[PDB]
DNA sequence: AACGGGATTTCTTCATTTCATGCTAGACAGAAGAATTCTCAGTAACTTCTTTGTGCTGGTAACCAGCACAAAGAAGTTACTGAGAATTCTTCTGTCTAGCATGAAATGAAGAAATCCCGTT
DNA sequence: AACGGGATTTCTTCATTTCATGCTAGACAGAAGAATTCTCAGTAACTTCTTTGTGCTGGTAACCAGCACAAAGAAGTTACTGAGAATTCTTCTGTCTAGCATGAAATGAAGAAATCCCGTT
């Protein structure tokens, strides 16, 4: 009877909802807002883990570590934009140099 | 104390970023900078910590503070 | 508490043969809240400009629409305006 | 150590500035904004500090080494790591 | 309803001789607003972080320290610190 | 008025609402909206103080946005605060590097 | 092609007012270039707003919220 | 270097309106009615952008020694801002 | 390629979430007065134009005044590893306060009028 | 210098505070848990700190090679009003359509050690 499996989501519809009434982002929350939102985070969360997992394979590795999330981000048109002023920990950097 | 940061240290950094010839004074133009930083960053992260009446600054006490300077640190959510 | 366990099952979804560490888990876990915080925000800033004192599924939409860029945006929409339906009719 | 070492550290991911000299450093600059007191620093809250402090000098270096290579040089200067700290805000 | 009835009240308080253009009054109010927010802003956020549902004066003070720079801080705080007691002892 | 007890001029009353209505919380202290009203008054009287000195400075008796733009960029403490801002019709600090 | 509404003489005024002396040659397109990733970037984030409450009238306030979302606060238009 | 101390001393929006006005509705039609007031706000903020843009960019021209702008600059500049 | 010490899995609980219905309510779809937004036309008329030139500036070498990377060395400084103390975040449990409700007037305010006047013409 | 368009002022009805009085809640004040973080001690283990040696980078003064500012006599086309023409924000109404409110029962998610297991030594 979980509201999450009812919306086909993995990410908590319940929790988010509540997380949405506490921080007082308003007085009333729709019955669909906390199932639409929670679904957007699932995608994004699956959107990185998608790539960050890949690079892991390209890096001859099957274990998501901070470094893999770094390249997953800095090697994607959309993400980098989004994660502008973000700084991944144990991230490292893109191997780009340039001469004269 | 500031000389806590060595030469190859600041270099390594300066190196990671893709720098060839690391000039003179540079070494102190880092101790200098890193000083302005840890400052604005610790004074912030400490005011929040004196709010909860704590004698221990919290991981989150810092993060909130970067999130004020305009730097969203990730890997530490308490 | 935290999204950790959820960030895991999904991980297995789009990648089974693959694993994760713990620091790289900290980041995920730091990622979720980072986007939550922006969406519910600008969506909160939204239901406000329009006197509405309630956040619709439409607020969060036009809210994502404004926070996620070109291509990232489009897909968060179809995963949303398709997550409300399979929630309502079923 | 040029085109050879400036591609080993990019490949690296860890810290570059020694932990303790930095640890000591934070606790002191901490001593000011407190009327002159001690203050426990989550061993946790300390690494965080650095992690960011690092990527701040690195990015701030490369974000400037493009200012050196502008005046047609290859030697970073204290001339560059201050132009940008004025071309950022 | 806007503060330009209060901004002006303070205007000719400090320079009771001087006036103001309705265009600066736009800056004025736009400003006061941009300031009301940033402070009540990171206050909602400060009462939020330290698990409470209360915004004391104590909050709207560490809230200022954190937003107003240098001596603009060490003066606005003793401008409130002073304006609150005089209230209590109404 | 409540701004009377607090002895202000900026609506201790209005803020309180504008503060419980913005959902910045669900429970607002009684000293808070009083405090913020004084902190707002200061800053607002503050900037004017400069806008209007350089207004008589620049030989003019009426404040125009330009004067607001000058008090700003001419207050080490104000420019810092008003970093991400821009005044409508305000030129700049006549400066040729 | 209305990207030519901005001109050599006009772009030179902003260039000049910005403490710029001897302008270059292509800075009369560069302008016409970035002014289009700014206005463009500010328009979208500002149109969606008009497109949210509902209407075909974009107010200075649909804009201003676009400039804040931008990271560039503007003064003098509120309400 | 004549006009420098003329326009710094002024505030009038340099770029004309109409040219600009269409320039906007055009990037708009890519997605109405514009309160004539709102077109100024999308203006005052527009020019304000360019101004502090070359300015901040000239230091890039007066660092390589140069005294003549170059697009070479409004690309290193817009590059250290992340815009 | 042999291992060091994290992930990955189970297996049990204290809460948190889903339930069930009755309600105040924010919300919405049908009217409508009217502020304006768009425009056409004008007489103004400022601006942007187009250009032929030469001045003042940028692009390359040339030849070079010193600076910074490479070492082979010298031995002090980073790591932590505990472990004790304890310096302290963290909880706890209901009095003592303290702020939210709900109203009923009672004023502080936004919005037109009209004289009164500063600073672009 | 001078008068034209923007306040300054004074007036009025109108919406938003305000004080009454409970009613919940929220802050609180030490009593001690359970944490972990300071404390030193004390070693081990590199990583720093040199001290030339000097390659070649940054200059600085020259020259060459153009690119950019400059009125000018104009007419393009941007201002500025004005009056509409009327498209549409906004305010209302009245009733929908709906999330809020519990009161607890139950299913879920955070936690405490323990066999397996992946990069790293």
TrEMBL record, chain G:
Signal peptide: none annotated. GO terms for cellular component: nucleosome; nucleus. Transmembrane segments: none annotated. The keyword Nucleus applies. Keywords: Acetylation, Chromosome, Citrullination, DNA-binding, Hydroxylation, Isopeptide bond, Methylation, Nucleosome core, Nucleus. It is found in: Chromosome; Nucleus. One of its GO terms (molecular function) is structural constituent of chromatin. Residues 4-69 form the TATA box binding protein associated factor (TAF) histone-like fold domain. The keyword Nucleus applies. It comes from the Eukaryota. Core component of nucleosome. Nucleosomes wrap and compact DNA into chromatin, limiting DNA accessibility to the cellular machineries which require DNA as a template. Histones thereby play a central role in transcription regulation, DNA repair, DNA replication and chromosomal stability. DNA accessibility is regulated via a complex set of post-translational modifications of histones, also called histone code, and nucleosome remodeling. The nucleosome is a histone octamer containing two molecules each of H2A, H2B, H3 and H4 assembled in one H3-H4 heterotetramer and two H2A-H2B heterodimers. The octamer wraps approximately 147 bp of DNA. Found in a co-chaperone complex with DNJC9, MCM2 and histone H3.3-H4 dimers. Within the complex, interacts with DNJC9 (via C-terminus); the interaction is direct. Interacts with NASP; NASP is a histone chaperone that stabilizes and maintains a soluble pool of Histone H3-H4 dimers. Belongs to the histone H4 family. This is Histone H4. The chain holds residues 25 to 103 of 103 of the full protein.
């Amino acid at each position: 009877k979980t509201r999450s499996s009812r919306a086909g989501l993995q990410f908590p519809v319940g929790r988010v909802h509540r997380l949405l009434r506490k921080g007082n982002y308003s007085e009333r929350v729709g019955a669909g807002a906390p199932v639409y939102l929670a679904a957007v985070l699932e995608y994004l969360t699956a959107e990185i883990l998608e790539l960050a997992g890949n690079a892991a394979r390209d890096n001859k590795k099957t274990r998501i570590i901070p470094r893999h999330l770094q390249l997953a981000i800095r090697n994607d048109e959309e993400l980098n934009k989004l994660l502008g002023r973000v700084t991944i920990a144990q991230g490292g950097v893109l191997p780009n140099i340039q001469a004269v | 104390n500031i000389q806590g940061i060595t030469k190859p240290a600041i270099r390594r950094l300066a190196r990671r970023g893709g720098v060839k010839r690391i000039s003179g004074l540079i070494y102190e133009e880092t101790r200098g900078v890193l000083k302005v930083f840890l400052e604005n960053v610790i004074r912030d992260a400490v005011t929040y910590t004196e709010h909860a009446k704590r004698k221990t600054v919290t991981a989150m006490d810092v993060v909130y503070a970067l999130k004020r300077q305009g730097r969203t640190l990730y890997g530490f959510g308490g | 508490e935290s999204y950790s366990i959820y960030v895991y099952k999904v991980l297995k979804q789009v990648h089974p043969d693959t694993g994760i560490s713990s620091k790289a888990m900290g980041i995920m876990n730091s990622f979720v809240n980072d986007i939550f915080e922006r969406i519910a925000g600008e969506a909160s800033r939204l239901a406000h400009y329009n006197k509405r004192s309630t956040i619709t599924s439409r607020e969060i939409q036009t809210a994502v629409r404004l926070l996620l860029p070109g291509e990232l945006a489009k897909h968060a929409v179809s995963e949303g305006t398709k997550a409300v339906t399979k929630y309502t009719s079923a | 150590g040029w085109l050879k070492e400036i591609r080993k550290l990019q490949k690296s991911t860890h810290l570059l500035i020694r932990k303790l000299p930095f640890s000591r450093l934070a606790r002191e600059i901490c001593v000011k904004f407190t009327r002159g007191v001690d203050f426990n620093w989550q061993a946790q809250a300390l690494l965080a500090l650095q992690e960011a402090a690092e990527a701040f000098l690195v990015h701030l270096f490369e974000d400037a080494y493009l200012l050196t290579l502008h005046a047609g040089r290859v030697t970073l200067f204290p001339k560059d790591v201050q132009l940008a700290r004025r071309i950022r805000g």
